[PDB]
């Protein structure tokens, strides 16, 4: 964008932070993906000291 | 089919108020006050001072100039009053910001003391120069009229000494002189006045 | 060609420079003699509490107009 | 800002009386004077100076 | 003449018949994400055109974040006109609105 009535509308209406829930079902659309899941089982284990 | 379309041609060139031949000096009176309504901008730097912000942008570039919408020469103004956009008077008037810009537009009434010459007026100005080509005048220290030769009474000749005028008095004539007004010009940035010395 | 393109540097007839539309709201009333004095004597002191001071003496060329020595 | 302000973003001249676009014209002045925009179908030519 | 004035007085009578008065306003007291993203938009486009500022700006060159500094401290001289669809409207200020 090229003007300051749009730099606020690329922050406070259409950022990737108000787009956390999709309006189709209310589900969340944003989350880790493949290996950032499989590090949780190793980080939050009971052997990981 | 030549009546119903002439309602907007003559009626527009019917210039509204004439000039009365008042004051019993023979002279016609052309200084006149007309109230109007503008439509101006207001820059965001003047968005705390909206009095100065309209006087400086649209009124001060209009004084001592011709204006094609009122018909006169703008001499001044008093009564610049911004119409509030809130139909509530009050001191905190509000105007509307445009969507695509930060400039706001608003209406303003004002009283412009225009100077309004037409044909058939009676005007007097100080003779600036004179030759065997015209006589240049200073109408009210600032306006210039110039009666050319083919509208002068052709009795009156010119002696050269850069020279001086020969009337039926035979006088190098001073400033103050009465004439009658031909087509006032609008063309240049300088407002030319044109007149005739036939009586 | 250049002179058709340097019109865009000479003209500058913007909307900041001119109002959009001026409409006369009433018919013009021919003022008297003495109030033209009584206007212009009070018109000059307007911005006199920058630029506009080449035009201030133009406004002060309106000053002499009725009482000086022409 | 994606269908006017960066596509074309022109400031054309529009006659307010007839409400057209293509019938306007920036005139030709005497070169002492200054050119300006004029509408064609709102004006009738100077030969029709009828009183 | 007055065919402008007869054309003018109708509008200001029309424009007065649509302002719903302040004791009878009937919309939300909130700043519903669309005032907030545009008030911050337009005010940031005023500071870029030398509007008078009324806060201790602390080296913040970013013209958008200056308006947020005045939004959370209520120094904005704006008035929101909310058009009800027949043409009537309620001129809410920015003080009397309540932010999220």
């Amino acid at each position: 964008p090229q003007n300051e009535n749009a730099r606020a509308e690329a922050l406070n209406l259409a950022n990737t932070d108000s787009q956390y829930l999709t309006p189709t079902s209310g589900s969340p659309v944003r989350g880790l993906i493949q290996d950032h899941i499989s590090a949780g089982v190793w980080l939050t284990s009971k052997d990981s000291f | 089919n030549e009546n119903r379309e002439t309602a907007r041609f003559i009626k527009k060139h019917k210039k509204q108020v004439t000039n009365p031949i008042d004051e019993k000096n023979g002279t016609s009176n052309c200084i006149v006050r007309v109230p109007i309504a503008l439509y101006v901008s207001l820059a965001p730097m003047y968005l705390e001072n909206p009095l100065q912000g309209v006087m400086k942008q649209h009124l001060n570039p209009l004084v001592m100039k011709y204006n094609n919408k009122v018909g006169g020469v703008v001499l001044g103004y008093e009564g610049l009053k911004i119409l509030d956009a809130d139909p509530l008077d009050t001191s905190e008037k509000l105007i509307k910001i445009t969507p695509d810009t930060p400039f706001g537009f608003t209406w303003c009434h004002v009283n412009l003391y225009v100077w309004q010459p037409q044909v058939g007026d009676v005007l007097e100005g100080y003779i600036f120069i004179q030759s065997a080509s015209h006589i240049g005048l200073l109408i009210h220290d600032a306006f210039n009229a110039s009666i050319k030769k083919n509208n002068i009474p052709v009795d009156w000749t010119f002696v050269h000494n850069l020279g001086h005028w020969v009337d039926s008095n035979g006088e190098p004539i001073d400033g103050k002189l009465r004439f009658t007004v031909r087509n006032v010009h609008t063309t240049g940035r300088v407002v030319s006045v044109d007149g005739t010395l036939i009586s | 060609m250049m002179k058709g393109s340097r019109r865009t540097g000479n003209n500058t007839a913007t909307t900041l420079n001119t109002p959009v539309v001026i409409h006369a709201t009433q018919l013009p009333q021919h003022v008297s003699t003495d109030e033209v004095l009584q206007f212009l004597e009070s018109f000059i002191d307007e911005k006199e509490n920058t630029n506009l001071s080449s035009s201030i003496s133009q406004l002060k060329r309106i000053q002499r107009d009725f009482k000086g020595l022409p | 800002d994606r269908l006017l302000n960066s596509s074309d973003y022109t400031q054309a001249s529009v006659c307010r009386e007839c409400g057209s676009i293509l019938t306007t014209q920036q005139s030709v002045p005497r070169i002492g004077s200054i050119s300006t925009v004029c509408c064609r179908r709102c004006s009738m030519r100077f030969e029709d100076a009828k009183k | 003449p007055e065919d402008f004035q007869q054309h003018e007085q109708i509008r200001r009578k029309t424009l007065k018949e649509k302002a719903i008065p302040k004791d009878q306003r009937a919309t939300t007291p909130y700043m519903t994400k669309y005032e907030r993203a545009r008030i911050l938009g337009t005010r940031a486009l005023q500071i870029s055109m030398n509007a008078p500022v009324f806060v201790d700006l602390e080296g913040e060159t970013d013209p958008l974040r200056i308006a947020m500094k005045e939004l959370a401290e209520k120094k904005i001289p704006l008035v929101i006109r909310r058009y009800l669809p027949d043409g009537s409207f309620e001129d809410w200020s920015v003080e009397e609105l309540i932010v999220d």
Side-chain angles (χ1 to χ4, degrees), chain B residues 17-127:
Chain B
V17 179
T18 62
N19 295 110
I21 44 169
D22 283 330
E23 294 177 354
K24 274 76 177 176
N25 200 5
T27 62
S28 61
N29 197 359
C30 291
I31 293 97
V32 56
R33 178 176 60 241
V34 51
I36 59 169
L38 286 84
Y39 188 68
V40 297
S41 71
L42 190 64
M45 63 181 292
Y46 298 102
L47 200 63
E48 185 65 30
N49 188 2
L51 296 173
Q52 188 181 5
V54 184
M55 294 172 181
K56 187 173 261 75
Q57 293 179 356
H58 302 89
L59 301 179
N60 286 316
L62 196 62
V63 298
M64 292 301 293
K65 295 177 185 177
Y66 196 76
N67 194 0
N68 296 320
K69 289 295 289 184
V70 296
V73 175
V74 172
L75 302 174
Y77 65 98
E78 188 170 1
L80 183 70
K81 180 173 69 66
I82 299 171
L83 286 82
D84 197 2
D86 182 75
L88 57 94
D89 291 335
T90 189
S91 179
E92 299 175 354
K93 301 180 181 68
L94 51 86
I95 64 169
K96 179 179 285 187
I97 299 294
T98 45
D100 287 329
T101 57
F103 291 93
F105 293 109
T106 184
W107 287 81
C108 296
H109 295 106
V110 83
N111 309 120
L112 296 185
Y113 285 97
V114 299
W115 179 74
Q116 185 178 4
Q118 294 184 0
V119 295
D121 291 336
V122 178
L123 288 175
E124 294 184 354
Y126 280 105
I127 289 175

Side-chain angles (χ1 to χ4, degrees), chain B residues 154-173:
Chain B
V154 196
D155 292 329
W156 292 0
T157 64
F158 183 78
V159 61
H160 178 75
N161 193 0
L162 198 147
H164 294 87
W165 189 261
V166 179
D167 52 355
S168 67
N169 284 316
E171 295 295 326
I173 49 182

Side-chain angles (χ1 to χ4, degrees), chain E residues 13-77:
Chain E
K13 180 174 71 69
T14 301
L15 186 144
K16 193 170 184 177
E17 284 293 327
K18 292 176 182 178
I20 296 170
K22 183 53 68 178
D23 49 356
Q24 299 173 0
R25 59 189 180 183
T27 58
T28 175
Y30 275 160
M31 186 172 288
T32 69
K33 190 193 284 188
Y34 289 92
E35 298 99 2
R36 188 181 184 272
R38 188 175 174 180
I39 287 174
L40 293 176
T42 300
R43 188 69 171 89
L45 200 57
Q46 293 183 353
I47 311 162
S48 64
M49 299 298 288
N50 304 322
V53 189
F54 303 103
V55 75
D56 287 328
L57 54 94
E58 299 172 356
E60 189 67 32
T61 60
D62 200 1
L64 184 63
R65 198 182 296 269
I66 300 171
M68 295 168 67
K69 188 180 290 183
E70 288 184 352
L71 179 62
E73 294 178 355
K74 297 290 184 180
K75 299 289 182 66
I76 303 171

Side-chain angles (χ1 to χ4, degrees), chain C residues 9-62:
Chain C
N10 195 5
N11 192 4
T12 60
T14 65
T15 61
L16 285 88
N17 202 359
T18 60
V20 176
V21 280
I22 287 175
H23 295 284
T25 183
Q26 289 176 358
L27 270 71
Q29 185 178 5
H30 285 278
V31 292
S32 65
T33 297
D34 291 332
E35 288 181 351
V36 178
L37 170 66
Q38 196 170 2
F39 163 65
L40 289 175
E41 189 179 3
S42 178
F43 175 72
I44 298 165
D45 200 2
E46 188 176 5
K47 299 293 183 182
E48 297 183 356
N49 192 0
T50 61
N51 198 355
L52 184 49
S53 62
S54 67
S55 301
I56 286 173
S57 183
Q58 298 172 356
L59 297 177
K60 288 185 179 181
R61 280 181 175 176
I62 308 172

Side-chain angles (χ1 to χ4, degrees), chain E residues 73-86:
Chain E
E73 294 178 355
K74 297 290 184 180
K75 299 289 182 66
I76 303 171
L78 290 177
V79 166
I80 299 298
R81 177 170 290 173
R82 291 174 172 173
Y83 295 104
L84 287 175
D86 64 346

